[model samples]
Target: AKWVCKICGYIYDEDAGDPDNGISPGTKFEELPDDWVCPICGAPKSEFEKL
Candidate 1:
């Protein structure tokens, strides 16, 4: 599953994106940091979603 930010719609896809900057590809959602911010925007994890 992927995480989408509700505030700005920043999509977090561990399985299909560059993780070197934050999350590497093939990494699980749970592996993401608790305070990770959106790349497109600087929104916190609170703004993310599974949708």
Candidate 2:
């Protein structure tokens, strides 16, 4: 499963994770920290859409 950032069109890959933000690989989108924003455009998780 993956998530798409609606604000920046950033795709959050469950396998790739967000290393730049310290989000480990295999991390689920729902498991991300509340403070975790899109690394691309700094959009909040609320700005994301499930894909």
Candidate 3:
């Protein structure tokens, strides 16, 4: 699954840091830090969409 911020359109892909994209990965969505803020608009998890 994937999520996107409604305000800034920050798309958070479940595979965001996949090796295929040439990036190292981190924790899953449900495993994300509670203090994680949206890098784009800082809306937090409440502003995301299950896209």
Best candidate, lDDT? 2
Candidate 1 lDDT score relative to the true structure: 0.73
Q: lDDT of all predictions, in order shown? A: 0.73, 0.92, 0.66
**Per-residue lDDT of model 3, residues 7-44, tens digit only:** 89977776664334333465466665676657767887
lDDT-based ranking:
2, 1, 3
Best by TM-score: 2
Q: What TM-score goes with each of the models? A: 0.72, 0.93, 0.69
Which residue pairs collide in model 2, if any?
A: none
Residue by residue across 1-51, what tens digits does model 2's lDDT show? 789999889899989999878999999999999999999999999999888
RMSD of 3: 4.4
Stronger candidate by TM-score (1 vs 3)? 1
Model 2 shows how many backbone clashes? 0
Q: Model 1, 1-51: lDDT tens per residue?
A: 788878887777767754656677877666767766777788877777886
**31 Cα displacement, candidate 1 (Å):** 1.2
Question: Which 10 consecutive positions of candidate 2 have the poorest summed lDDT?
Answer: 1-10
lDDT computed for candidate 2 = 0.92
lDDT of 3 at 51: 85
